[PDB]
Amino acid sequence: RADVAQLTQELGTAFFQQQQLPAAMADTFLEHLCLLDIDSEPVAARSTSIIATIGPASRSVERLKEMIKAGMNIARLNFSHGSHEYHAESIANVREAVESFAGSPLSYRPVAIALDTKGPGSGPGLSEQDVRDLRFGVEHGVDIVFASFVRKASDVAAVRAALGPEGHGIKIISKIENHEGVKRFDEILEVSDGIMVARGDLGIEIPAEKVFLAQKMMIGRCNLAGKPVVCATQMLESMITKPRPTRAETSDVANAVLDGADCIMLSGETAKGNFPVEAVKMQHAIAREAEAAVYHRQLFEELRRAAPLSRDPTEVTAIGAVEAAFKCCAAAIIVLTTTGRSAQLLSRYRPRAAVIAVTRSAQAARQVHLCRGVFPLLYREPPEAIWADDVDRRVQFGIESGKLRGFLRVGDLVIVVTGWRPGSGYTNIMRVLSIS
Amino acid sequence: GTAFFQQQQLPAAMADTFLEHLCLLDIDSEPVAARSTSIIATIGPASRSVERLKEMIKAGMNIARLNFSHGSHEYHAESIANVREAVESFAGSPLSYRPVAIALDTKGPGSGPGLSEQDVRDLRFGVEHGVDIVFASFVRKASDVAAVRAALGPEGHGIKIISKIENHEGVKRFDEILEVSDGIMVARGDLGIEIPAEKVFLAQKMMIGRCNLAGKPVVCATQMLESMITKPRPTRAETSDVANAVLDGADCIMLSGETAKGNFPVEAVKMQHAIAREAEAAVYHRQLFEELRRAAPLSRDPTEVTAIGAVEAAFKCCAAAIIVLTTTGRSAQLLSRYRPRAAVIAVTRSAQAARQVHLCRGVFPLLYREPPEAIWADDVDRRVQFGIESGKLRGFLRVGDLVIVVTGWRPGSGYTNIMRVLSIS
Amino acid sequence: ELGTAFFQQQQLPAAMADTFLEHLCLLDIDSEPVAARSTSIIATIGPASRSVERLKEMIKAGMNIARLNFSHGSHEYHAESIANVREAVESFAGSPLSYRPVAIALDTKGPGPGLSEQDVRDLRFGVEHGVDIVFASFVRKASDVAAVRAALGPEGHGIKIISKIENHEGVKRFDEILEVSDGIMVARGDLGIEIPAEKVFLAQKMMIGRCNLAGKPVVCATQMLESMITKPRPTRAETSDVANAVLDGADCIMLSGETAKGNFPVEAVKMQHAIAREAEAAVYHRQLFEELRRAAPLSRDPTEVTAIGAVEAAFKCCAAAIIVLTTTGRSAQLLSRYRPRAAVIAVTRSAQAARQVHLCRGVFPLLYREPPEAIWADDVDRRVQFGIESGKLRGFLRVGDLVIVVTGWRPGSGYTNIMRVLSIS
Amino acid sequence: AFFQQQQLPAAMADTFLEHLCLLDIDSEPVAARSTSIIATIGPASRSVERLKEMIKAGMNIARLNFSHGSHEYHAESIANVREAVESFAGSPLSYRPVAIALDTKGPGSGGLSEQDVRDLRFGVEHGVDIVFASFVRKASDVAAVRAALGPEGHGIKIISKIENHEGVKRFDEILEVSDGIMVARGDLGIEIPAEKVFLAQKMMIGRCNLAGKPVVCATQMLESMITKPRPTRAETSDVANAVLDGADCIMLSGETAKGNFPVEAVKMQHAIAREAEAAVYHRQLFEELRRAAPLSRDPTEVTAIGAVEAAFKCCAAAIIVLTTTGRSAQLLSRYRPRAAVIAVTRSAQAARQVHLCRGVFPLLYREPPEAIWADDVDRRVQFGIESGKLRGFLRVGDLVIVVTGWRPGSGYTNIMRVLSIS
Numbered sequence A: 001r002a003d004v005a006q007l008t009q010e011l012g013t014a015f016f017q018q019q020q021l022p023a024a025m026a027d028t029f030l031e032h033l034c035l036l037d038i039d040s041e042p043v044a045a046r047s048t049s050i051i052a053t054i055g056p057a058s059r060s061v062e063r064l065k066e067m068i069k070a071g072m073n074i075a076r077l078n079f080s081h082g083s084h085e086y087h088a089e090s091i092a093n094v095r096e097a098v099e100s101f102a103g104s105p106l107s108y109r110p111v112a113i114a115l116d117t118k119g120p121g122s123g124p125g126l127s128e129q130d131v132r133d134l135r136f137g138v139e140h141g142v143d144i145v146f147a148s149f150v151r152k153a154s155d156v157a158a159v160r161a162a163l164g165p166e167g168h169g170i171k172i173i174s175k176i177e178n179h180e181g182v183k184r185f186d187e188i189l190e191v192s193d194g195i196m197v198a199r200g201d202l203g204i205e206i207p208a209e210k211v212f213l214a215q216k217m218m219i220g221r222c223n224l225a226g227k228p229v230v231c232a233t234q235m236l237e238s239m240i241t242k243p244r245p246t247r248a249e250t251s252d253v254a255n256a257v258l259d260g261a262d263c264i265m266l267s268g269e270t271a272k273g274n275f276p277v278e279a280v281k282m283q284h285a286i287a288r289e290a291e292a293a294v295y296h297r298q299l300f301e302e303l304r305r306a307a308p309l310s311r312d313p314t315e316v317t318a319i320g321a322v323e324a325a326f327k328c329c330a331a332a333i334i335v336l337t338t339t340g341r342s343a344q345l346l347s348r349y350r351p352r353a354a355v356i357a358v359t360r361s362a363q364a365a366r367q368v369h370l371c372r373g374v375f376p377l378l379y380r381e382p383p384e385a386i387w388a389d390d391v392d393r394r395v396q397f398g399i400e401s402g403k404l405r406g407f408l409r410v411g412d413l414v415i416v417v418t419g420w421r422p423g424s425g426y427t428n429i430m431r432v433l434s435i436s
Numbered sequence B: 001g002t003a004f005f006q007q008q009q010l011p012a013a014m015a016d017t018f019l020e021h022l023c024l025l026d027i028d029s030e031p032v033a034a035r036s037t038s039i040i041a042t043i044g045p046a047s048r049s050v051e052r053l054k055e056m057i058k059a060g061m062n063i064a065r066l067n068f069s070h071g072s073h074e075y076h077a078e079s080i081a082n083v084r085e086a087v088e089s090f091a092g093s094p095l096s097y098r099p100v101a102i103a104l105d106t107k108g109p110g111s112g113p114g115l116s117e118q119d120v121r122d123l124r125f126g127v128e129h130g131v132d133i134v135f136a137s138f139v140r141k142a143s144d145v146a147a148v149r150a151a152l153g154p155e156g157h158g159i160k161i162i163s164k165i166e167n168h169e170g171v172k173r174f175d176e177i178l179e180v181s182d183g184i185m186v187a188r189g190d191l192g193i194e195i196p197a198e199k200v201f202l203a204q205k206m207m208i209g210r211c212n213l214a215g216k217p218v219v220c221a222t223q224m225l226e227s228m229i230t231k232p233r234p235t236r237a238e239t240s241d242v243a244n245a246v247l248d249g250a251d252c253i254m255l256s257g258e259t260a261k262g263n264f265p266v267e268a269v270k271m272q273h274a275i276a277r278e279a280e281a282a283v284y285h286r287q288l289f290e291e292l293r294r295a296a297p298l299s300r301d302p303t304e305v306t307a308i309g310a311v312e313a314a315f316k317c318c319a320a321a322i323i324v325l326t327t328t329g330r331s332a333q334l335l336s337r338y339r340p341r342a343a344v345i346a347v348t349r350s351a352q353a354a355r356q357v358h359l360c361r362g363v364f365p366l367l368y369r370e371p372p373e374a375i376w377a378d379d380v381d382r383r384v385q386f387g388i389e390s391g392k393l394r395g396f397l398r399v400g401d402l403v404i405v406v407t408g409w410r411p412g413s414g415y416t417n418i419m420r421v422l423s424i425s
Numbered sequence C: 001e002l003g004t005a006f007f008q009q010q011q012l013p014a015a016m017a018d019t020f021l022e023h024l025c026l027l028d029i030d031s032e033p034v035a036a037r038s039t040s041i042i043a044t045i046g047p048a049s050r051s052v053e054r055l056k057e058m059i060k061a062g063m064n065i066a067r068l069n070f071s072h073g074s075h076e077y078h079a080e081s082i083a084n085v086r087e088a089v090e091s092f093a094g095s096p097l098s099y100r101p102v103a104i105a106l107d108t109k110g111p112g113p114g115l116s117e118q119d120v121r122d123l124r125f126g127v128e129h130g131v132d133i134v135f136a137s138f139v140r141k142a143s144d145v146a147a148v149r150a151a152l153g154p155e156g157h158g159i160k161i162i163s164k165i166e167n168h169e170g171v172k173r174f175d176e177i178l179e180v181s182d183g184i185m186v187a188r189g190d191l192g193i194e195i196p197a198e199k200v201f202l203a204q205k206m207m208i209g210r211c212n213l214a215g216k217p218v219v220c221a222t223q224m225l226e227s228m229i230t231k232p233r234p235t236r237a238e239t240s241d242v243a244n245a246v247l248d249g250a251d252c253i254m255l256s257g258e259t260a261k262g263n264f265p266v267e268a269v270k271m272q273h274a275i276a277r278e279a280e281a282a283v284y285h286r287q288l289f290e291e292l293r294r295a296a297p298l299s300r301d302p303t304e305v306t307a308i309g310a311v312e313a314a315f316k317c318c319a320a321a322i323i324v325l326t327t328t329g330r331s332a333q334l335l336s337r338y339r340p341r342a343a344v345i346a347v348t349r350s351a352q353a354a355r356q357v358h359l360c361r362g363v364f365p366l367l368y369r370e371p372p373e374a375i376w377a378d379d380v381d382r383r384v385q386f387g388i389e390s391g392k393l394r395g396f397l398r399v400g401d402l403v404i405v406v407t408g409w410r411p412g413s414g415y416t417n418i419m420r421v422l423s424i425s
Numbered sequence D: 001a002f003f004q005q006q007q008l009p010a011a012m013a014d015t016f017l018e019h020l021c022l023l024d025i026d027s028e029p030v031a032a033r034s035t036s037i038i039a040t041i042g043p044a045s046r047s048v049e050r051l052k053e054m055i056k057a058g059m060n061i062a063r064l065n066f067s068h069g070s071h072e073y074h075a076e077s078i079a080n081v082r083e084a085v086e087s088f089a090g091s092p093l094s095y096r097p098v099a100i101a102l103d104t105k106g107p108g109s110g111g112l113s114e115q116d117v118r119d120l121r122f123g124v125e126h127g128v129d130i131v132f133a134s135f136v137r138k139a140s141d142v143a144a145v146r147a148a149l150g151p152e153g154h155g156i157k158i159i160s161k162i163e164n165h166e167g168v169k170r171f172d173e174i175l176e177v178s179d180g181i182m183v184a185r186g187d188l189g190i191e192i193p194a195e196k197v198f199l200a201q202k203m204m205i206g207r208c209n210l211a212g213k214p215v216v217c218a219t220q221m222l223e224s225m226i227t228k229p230r231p232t233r234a235e236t237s238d239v240a241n242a243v244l245d246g247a248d249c250i251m252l253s254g255e256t257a258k259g260n261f262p263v264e265a266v267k268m269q270h271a272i273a274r275e276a277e278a279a280v281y282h283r284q285l286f287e288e289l290r291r292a293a294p295l296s297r298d299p300t301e302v303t304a305i306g307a308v309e310a311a312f313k314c315c316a317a318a319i320i321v322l323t324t325t326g327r328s329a330q331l332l333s334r335y336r337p338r339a340a341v342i343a344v345t346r347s348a349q350a351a352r353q354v355h356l357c358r359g360v361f362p363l364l365y366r367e368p369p370e371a372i373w374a375d376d377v378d379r380r381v382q383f384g385i386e387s388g389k390l391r392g393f394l395r396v397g398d399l400v401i402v403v404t405g406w407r408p409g410s411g412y413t414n415i416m417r418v419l420s421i422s
Ligand SMILES: O=S(=O)(NCc1ccc(S(=O)(=O)c2cccc(O)c2)cc1)c1ccc(O)c(O)c1
Pocket: A029, A030, A033, A220, A223, A258, A259, A260, A294, A295, A296, A297, A298, A299, A300, A302, A303, B018, B019, B020, B022, B209, B247, B248, B249, B283, B284, B285, B286, B287, B288, B289, B291
């Protein structure tokens, strides 16, 4: 009580009853569970990204606008079905729906485009159709590749080579769908940007009753590595034909978030189902509840202890900033990033504070949706003559978008993370600012 | 041996942090322990035949649920008789006989404020037919439990009352309901309609946590393997749901339509059995036991003191089992609350207690049918040997294993006070 | 049941704290110690403490082990010291409330590369005079212990060898020395000359920690109350030193010149007694027991498994004592290694074991001399009641208290496998 | 080699038992001694030449015991201390500030005595930094001392001496209004049973550590060194245990005031404190300090925990902080970082007073000002870095954490920076 008494008197008892704060402050995991409250409403913005598969049920520009408003962050194109012409039209429709909100830069929501490959099938490695589809992705500017049936590190090197010199910036998320992928997980994760727990094929390749062990192990190892992990397949399966999900389905979504997943995915629920927008809304609602129920007290202690000592200033600043944010219940951590890396290093410590990432890179703004709790703001202004003033303008842009989206209020504390010189790789400063 | 320490997620169970525990989970680490989470199967047209009920007992059904929201007293009496006929068909081999509890799930109050007149008639039927458990529908306050207890009368004092929490008021008045109940059921079907669907997981995790703290049984119910009503395999969300209910701390998992009216009732029981075994091995006992020990209050009750000493002793030697002699099941329940990895083999002469201890995770009841020996200490030893011989036949024990034996200083309930380290010969 | 006053004594609020910081903040000078003093006091016998009348006063003040320093005096001088100690100890044989066994320890002169000629003759003298313990001076390697062990001839293998670590080599070869020794003495006098004085506290804390991990006795020695050789009261550094040796985990604390040649030998014993009682109540059992439990390897030895189960049971009910039947002292030692807050009352038929168990913190020996009963279970019950009645007589127990009883399944050393919860009647 | 020094295997242990088992007599201390030494000035330590030797041996605070001697005697003691301290001012990168503390006579049979009022006024007139207020029993005793210091003595630190049962019982109210505490074991050991003093010491140190306020352990720490060249085994153990308990300062009374080995007593406390600081179990300590410290919306408090967390993440050689009053350095010190807290200040009084906080190394900035505030700030940072390099705290390639504010004036610390040396 004395460790939260003055902040309780200051912020009020109502503040400490919302977002499962009594449960988050508990001394044991048992007490944390006992303190979970259905009347404790979530306050924070939803941090787990939603990946929606695009298909006949979610292809129209008007339908895509509704899905963006419902919470879709990443659009998945399943190259197991449809022609290149079909997928190019899907891409164009997504971009048209996304840019329809670009008129207001302080509220614009970027949406990443991910290409899910067909896979090797009976083959030993990269198929000829995969090579053509990967070149299509580079030519159409996709942000992410979900590489199907990755079984070893050489499979991801083949995908990287097929993307060529122009696709160096594309993120490769390896799909683990069989026993070999699970057994060679460490070598696959080392060369990948992230992982997808593809439970559909995984549940056929290994006994169905063992999939939860593979999911929890891979999420844990991705969290340890600080790399994005996606939980996928049959999350809200019954919503393909019904307006409401089963009790097992809502539980599954909540548990993927509690496990530590950065992203949650919808496949047939959005691609061919009768309720694509409702499926996105349901994942949004469950993820907000589940994020507030995360036991940050032990989680942060374990992430901190597991993370090795580092002499990289971005790594050092990131842990100092997350520690500072927890100390004052900071509403947000505003970070300036070029590639998204500084925001990713903040995200790996699982702060409760939203990580508002201000970037000039449209691709980085789309790709940071892979990292839990990163809210990208695309800055379109031309540079100031004085670099320090250009930095300050970018920080104020983050505060003003934060106030105009509800993340920040006057009186809040914010943590600002910047670097000492222009260019990527020099983040080294953490500032505590009071919102006026 | 090295092989012993690679099975049943033992590297993951020994980890120093929960993060390291998750990272060490292995799909190739096979479960060795017997399945400790009980399976409740609802009886209906798909699972009423004596031959079908025998298959479900072999698949792992521990409790048969009679849903009094459907069917007449005549229908439920035939269900009871069919269950008992299927259960007693294995009584010829006492070392392998599996007791099966009968639970009566009430229709509920409906629009009424308290106990309905149909519920009073159904509760009397249950007492007259010897049901072991009552799943009391829509419990909203402690007085609802007292009304059910009064309707059971003096002859139904031994029946367990498991309160179903199905609405916001039941969640808010949870502590007072749990205090007077024998346990709880998280009735997710109605709960998901009474409260927002996206909040049911918080109510489930909270109630399971509080029941685990109280040392009282908690059942997770509804739509666990819903798709298996028409399909032979469940969805990825359904297997995850069953595994997570076990990881949350549920003592029992339930099947409703999957066994009452579906096309795969035996397969639905086999699937819950398979998932529960995997999930139990993935329990992080290192932190779990530490938290249960610290949360449990100090006690001057010798059964309570012997139970914690026995669970501590079982962890120290990796005991294959804790064999406990019990009359009412209470000594086995107090062992179960500390969540030992060792199976709790409960030897009893009470057929009702043998059925009712299925409510407690990790309790394997053995019904002893021999008449008492003239010398009490010899009668005690004969029962303990019956526990060892059943354990060996069923695969729980092998020669060379260490077992913890929990007994009392005199006959009669309430006198457990002895813990003994035994080597299996 | 116990009252608010019970939970305010013996630093119980501080012992229940969730963190070590909160434990320190809750220490209270008004919280009085209730438990009997568990850290044994070793007093060096010399001109100031040799008379039978003076030795009776030191026994009453709390002396448990009499140390004979073979660096000074002849065999004839030490034989008279032994006879005077035995005469003073046996002067209380008539009164059960006052009779306490007192061990006799021989501290060797020391080495030369290995065992000196005088040490061989002195060790032979110790065997001939029935000493219980040998404090082997300047042990540097495992072969030094083996030489002392071999010098204990055909008749002295039951004597305990406590190795004195007095130099850099002994500290560096600590693990191999501890493995072959019965215990260790942190001989700070010579150690403080052999290594920099400012590093002695590191060596003391390390050796005490490793001895606690191994479950072997550790003695903290030299200059603990040095100023009391000439002054009636010690310095603030001296009382702090005694308290910190107990808090570190020392089984025994020692007095050298303070008792052998000083002006206040009895007052020095009284002061160590007073400080040790306060320091024992201030032990942070919550984290201590958790760490001892986790550090101790898994065991298939039933004595080791019973001991942890019994200490866990004692903590659960705030047992007034753990009564253990032991012939060699081993069962009492395995209880002592988990640092229970309850007194370990060790009932033995062995006078040697009764004297030697003073090396283990919290062990209160009772020598039992009744003729054996024909029925073994009757003999066991009689020794258990002897422990309860002596406990009642000495203030450890009252009617209504709970005790933990540790016994085995058959006669003979090595079969402890039973833990019972008993109510004092 | 780096990970074998300063008990680093023992500091990384998963349990306190394993931490103890891993303590190594061959693991040498590398960090600068963080626990300050308070030496009592008397006949054996009054000469300017003797005081220079004590400053070199490690004396950080000079204590004037007003229970003995006249105002004329103490004024000469003050002048001799200042002369010895300023004899090293020729080299600003290595100059060591020394605080002057006035220990009052006390109330005796009486609240605040008339002699105490005259002595407190003497202290203000002679510019003392700290007052060790004898026999404090309640919060009103502290208020009386504060009032006696008047308007000219607002900046003086009041360290309350707890010497009796009432002071122990009313501890929380006394600590709330005091700047810190002294565990005055001499009188405490006569007022309460001697066997209970260790409980009072450990409780008060724990509560001061929780409050983030300085605590001094005092009396008979190396008593035998008044006549002997080496201390007893109990005395070295006592000093080590006071440091391990969490004391910010350790004190010498008769050992330096009247003993035959005043310089050797200071050297012995220095040697023991260095060893004891390396044996601190930071893994559990930092976790507990972090959890115990309340949530805060004060940017200095928030920056302090972020900086200590960052220092542990990279094994930073130092945390360089700019402070006017010493407060920013005190808030870093409360989290017990292994990294030295190099406090760069212009205030000569703050530089002397921060010796009360464990691990704070004051540097008195006497370099010319920069016209641009930002350039002035960077220059004070470079000053900390050069003084750290000269004194052995830092080497090229080391990482430091730099703690500054957004605008001039005290109370605005809000920035933490990760900097690579040279
Ligand atoms: O939110 S956490 O901090 N939770 C950790 C946790 C602790 C203990 C258990 S227990 O011992 O199984 C248990 C204990 C009590 C009741 C009970 O029902 C179960 C479970 C979980 C987290 C999540 C993911 C991570 O990767 C991580 O590093 C940390």
